[model samples]
Target: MSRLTIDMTDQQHQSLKALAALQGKTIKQYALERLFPGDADADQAWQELKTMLGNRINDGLAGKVSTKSVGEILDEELSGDRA
Candidate 1:
């Protein structure tokens, strides 16, 4: 929600364009990442979380953890025993 105005030489603009293209990002995106970080850090964090969740799902399919429905989960809660 903010705007910036500035001036750059033709060489500067062209260099930026080439660098942005090399990074496979738009000029605005490249500038933003340089100006504000944690953008890349957050991306890496989200990827780690996704991989952890995927591993959990794989464990469930492999019976590393038991699977049960909610109705069945509470039936033995009174006695406090779960398998």
Candidate 2:
């Protein structure tokens, strides 16, 4: 109902808008969902929220996470370029 301000670099701004356009939503709608997912009163929303919580619990119980970055892991994996 109101407004909020958040800061990002120009590259982040461009990347966010590009991702939003790919999803067929303007920056506003994309942000609303990104920050507050499933705010609506609907079965699907509730299911998504419940699923998210369950995933959080599972991930929490599963154990430690690797300190490696995506680039580090990707370097050891196949690029899947075979066509």
Candidate 3:
């Protein structure tokens, strides 16, 4: 991960913060969206993937998901009908 620091006067930074607040976004999010429009879709996809993973983890913790051994899973993949 990399860090980017923007140098701004106190008044300019305050105005930016106000504008971001008006748009219901952090300054960081607003800046990123403005700089990289494509990042919006990527962020959405990442959020969805994280939600899916969280749900899967919850299901597993609740014993609602299947428990397959590593070897069994490997064998199934190696010799399955699709293979």
Over the stretch 1-83, how does candidate 3's per-residue lDDT look in tens digits?
66588888899888877788789988887865666665577687875555433422333343223463211122223445323
Query: Model 2: how far is 60 from its true place, Å?
Result: 42
Stretches of candidate 2 above 4 Å error?
38-83
Model 1 worst lDDT window (10 residues): 68-77
Give the TM-score comparing model 3 with the true structure, all chains together: 0.37
| Model 1 regions more than 4 Å off | 37-83
How far residue 28's Cα lies from its native spot in candidate 1, in Å, is 0.6
Q: Candidate 1, residue 30: CA error in Å?
A: 0.3
Candidate 1 residue lDDT tens string, 15-81: 8767887889877778666667656776878765554334223333432244532222223333343
- Please report, in order, the local distance difference test score of every candidate based on alpha carbons: 0.57, 0.57, 0.57
Q: What TM-score would every model get versus the actual structure?
A: 0.38, 0.41, 0.37
Instruction: Judge candidate 2 at residue 56 and give its lDDT.
Output: 29
The collision pairs in model 1 are none
Pairs with backbone N, CA or C atoms under 3 Å apart (clashes), candidate 2: none
